[model samples]
Target: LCVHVRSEEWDLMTFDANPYDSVLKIKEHVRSKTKVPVQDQVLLLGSKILKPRRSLSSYGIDKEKTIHLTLKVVK
Candidate 1:
């Protein structure tokens, strides 16, 4: 799936999400291509917050899907 990643901190990110991809892996890749650390990354699909341990396909994430990205302020 072609994932559309959006964040206020930076420009848009275009990623290809694998079927068995975990949110933690997603965060890892985000850090790979950018500066946001895994600890601060928060991924959201619609109003749903995706847990790091959860699978992307498990959330029914499809092609050209858009995910909202945010960060934890405390850290």
Candidate 2:
């Protein structure tokens, strides 16, 4: 799964969002727009670290697909 944050205060206070962009783009977009003090930034997938410029699809996630959930009783 991937998530992105889109803030309106881009360029001025440091916040921006692309309507038709990937989740990674959104994160970097926010980071760049804000110019916040930070040494390094990387996306998190489960327990692995995602590359800064890598797309979400590289992690075996397809945004266009639907997700179905089912829970089974273990007792």
Candidate 3:
């Protein structure tokens, strides 16, 4: 047997806040709505690809579409 990578996507909420702003700012907006922290979160592009190290718009993400992580694991 061998390990395989499993990939999945999900639908999550997107904000109307400016994508050009810093991630902390985005998290500030998020925190304004919820009690979650920015560091304990994930962001995805419009295609739902994981984007943990980049900004939303950098990966062709927009304000309209809901995006979530493309979760992946090897097992």
Top of the candidates by lDDT? 1
Which has the greatest TM-score? 1
Let me know the TM-score candidate 3 reaches against the reference structure: 0.23
TM-score of each: 0.32, 0.24, 0.23
| Candidate 1 C-alpha lDDT tens digits along 11-74 | 4445545586455575564555346544454556547765442344555644565554442221
Candidate with the larger lDDT of 2 and 3 = 3
Instruction: Estimate the TM-score for candidate 1.
Output: 0.32
Summing lDDT over every window of 10 consecutive residues in candidate 1, give the lowest-scoring window: 66-75
Candidate 2 residue pairs in backbone clash: 10-15, 14-33, 14-34
Model 1 lDDT, full chain set? 0.48
Give each model's clash number.
0, 3, 0
Clashing pairs in 1: none
Candidate 2 Cα deviation (angstroms), residue 50: 1.0
Across 20-40, the per-residue lDDT of candidate 3 in tens digits comes to 756665555455534644434
Model 1 alpha-carbon drift over 4 Å, by segment: 17-38, 52-74
